[PDB]
């Protein structure tokens, strides 16, 4: 327990020095407004990437459907040819692709729901930052008055 | 509610 | 949403609120002392009395 | 800061008025969706304005008290100067008296 | 935790000193005016490439 | 649309608001004090007396 | 991030110093008159070459 006590004492001393440097309200406030805006931009970029991914999956799904259609056309040609083996190969290609497409669709639906939720969340975030700015102005006025009052009280 | 208010204005 | 310490906005709000509340209480006490003094109270009374 | 809040409050009222004008235009247009969006904007702004007004009133009272305190302070410094002059005269006399007493 | 606080304090201190020097009405307005004009020119070049 | 704080369009609005608020507040406080002094009020009355 | 912002502020200050040295209208005006004529001549020469 002695080692723990020593660590705690060192930690307490370090914490005290750090808080004093960042004690002023204005310095803390400036950092916060800049940070939330930056975070929103980062979130937007992430959302854009997610949207792009969703678009890509849809394009891939469309491509898969197109590929299946192409295989079907080949199968029709094989029937005209009269070769049983050629037709069978085309059918096999269609089946594996179809299974993959079904799996992709389920994944896409889940992804789409998450993306929609994120968009809604972003709108809420925009309302919150605006509210914070109003709160900051009120806080600044109160702080200035309090500092003046304390000095007067001391006299 | 807005539609009802709008309708009243439209009325006259 | 969590209100975790790491977020910059959350940390700033807690520190500011505690400091402001303590200062306000101190300010109120200072105001009361001025009110408590006889001269401050007397001046308001005197002004009404003086004009007539 | 008090002036800024008042200006902000006025701006908020102006913004609400602008939204109302847009809503009127939407009604003329006949599109239900456009009108609804304008209404939502007005409601959030109104709530913010009410909160600001309460904060402003508290701030105004504090500011008024400070102004009164400043006037009191001015009277006090003037009194101190008079006190200082009296103290200086007494101190000079006391020092001279002590030396005389020693002899 | 302590290291993060120190980094934040250093950043805040640097920003506070920097903004006052930065906040000059004549310099800020001139810089902003110069930047927007430059940006417009860049956009035209991009538009030309698109047109091409 | 958003960009960064350094960019002129976003920054210009912030600098102007801060500068305007500070200038207005300082001017208003000084003006009120001059009005409060008894001598200024007396001078206006004196001028009328001087004129007749 | 901070360094980039600092550089912009420095650049604005530098720009202000530079314009003041060349602020006088007559030196700039003479140069401008010479430049447009030179540009026109180059354009004319190019036009002549195209015509040729």
Residue numbers in the entry:
A (entry chain P): 1 to 155
B (entry chain A): 208 to 219
C (entry chain K), F (entry chain L): 156 to 207
D (entry chain V): 53 to 155
E (entry chain Q), G (entry chain R): 1 to 52
Paper quotes:
This homology is evident in cryo-electron microscopy structures of Vipp1 rings from the cyanobacterium Nostoc punctiforme presented over a range of symmetries.
Reconstructions were also generated for the other six symmetries and complete ring models built. To test whether the dome-shaped curvature observed in Vipp1 rings depends on a combination of inter-rung contacts and geometric constraints, as suggested by these data, an idealized elastic-network model of the Vipp1C11 ring was constructed. Strikingly, the cumulative helix α5 rotation (Δϕ) between all rung interfaces plateaued near 40°, indicating a strict geometrical bending limit. Remarkably, this maximal rotation within the simulated stacks closely matched the measured experimental Δϕ in Vipp1C11, as well as the cumulative ∼40° helix α5 rotations observed for Vipp1C14. Thus, the simulations suggest a simple self-regulatory mechanism for limiting ring stack size where stress from inter-rung rotation builds up until the formation of Interfaces 1 and 3 is no longer favorable beyond a geometrical limit of ∼40°, after which further stacking is impeded. This is close to the biophysical limit required to induce membrane fusion/fission (Chernomordik et al., 1995; Kozlovsky and Kozlov, 2003).
